[PDB]
Every structure is written in C-alpha cells, then in structure tokens.
Amino acid sequence: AAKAGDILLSHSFEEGTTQGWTARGGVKVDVTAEQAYQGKQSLQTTGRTEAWNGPSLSLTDVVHKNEVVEISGYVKLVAGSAPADLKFTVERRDGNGDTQYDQVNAAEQVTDQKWVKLQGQYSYEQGSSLLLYLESTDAKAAYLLDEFQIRLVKAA
C-alpha cells in the first residue's frame, strides 16, 4: 500500500497513551514527563528482572512480507542505572508457526547521562506475527524511549 520514504509509524509519546507499546514480562510500561528527547514526554520501562523483558510493540499490522523498513528511536537509562547495552529485536512466527528471533541492530552502550540513537533495517520472508521489543543484556536496567519511527525503505 505504501511507497519508499513513507512513514509507517511515528511515536512522540506527547499525548496520554503508550501508543500501543505494552509490557513484555512483569514490567511497568508507561509515559513519563520527567525526561524526554523531544517535547515533554517519553516512554519509560521499569521493573525488569530478566534480560528478555522490555517494552514491546506488535508490528503484525505495520510490516508486511518482503518490505524493507527502517526502525529508529532515541534511548536513555533511568537515573541511577549503571551503563548497559540496548538493542531492538523482532520475535516472529515463521511460515510453520515456529518462533524466530531476528536482529534489527547491534546493541549500543547507553548511560543515564545522554540520549543515544538506535537504528536498523528490518525485513522478513515468511511469517504470521511480528513483535518488536527493546531489550538489554543487563536484566535489571530501566530505560526510556522517545521519537520512535518506522519508515518504508523498499516496497515489497
């Protein structure tokens, strides 16, 4: 339906809602006015106990077969957290219904002192469901996300 260069999703978190982002694990995912990269608000994740926990977003309705997309956003650790590495991952059901974990970007070191840009391209060849999440190998890190975007690079 879309063409190269089109915005598929854009999240500033400047209204009341998490704009579809939801908890993965027994975590708390909500909007905060304490910190932001742009505007007044960002998306905050706390209460992580395992490394696979984080804020998550279904992409099932956003990304379709063989489309190349570009996923980006700005991240920062919650005040007090030690330096930790953050990346985006897509959990995908393949053609057979089997679970696959696809890498979007290399993990970047992030601190509680500055916002860091994360970005990578993504596509898939077979599958029925797609779930994006933001994770750290540090199982207890808490962190913020702002100015999240997905852009179509190449139509299918």
Q: Which residues contact Ca ion (rule: CB under 5 A)? A: 12-13, 36, 38-39, 41, 146
Decide whether 31 or 59 has the Cβ nearer to Ca ion: 31
Determine how many CB atoms are found less than 10 A away from the CB of residue 103.
Answer: 12
Q: Are 90 and 130 in contact (CB under 8 A)?
A: yes
Element (H or E) spanning 76, and its range? Answer: strand 68-77
Residue with Cβ nearer Ca ion (38 or 137): 38
Minimum CB distance to Ca ion, residue 33 (Å): 10
Of 41 and 89, the one with the shorter C-beta distance to Ca ion is 41
Residue nearest to Ca ion (CB): 39
Q: Are 43 and 146 in contact (CB under 8 A)?
A: yes
Distance CA 70, CA 3 (A): 13
Least spacing, CB of residue 36 vs Ca ion, in Å: 4
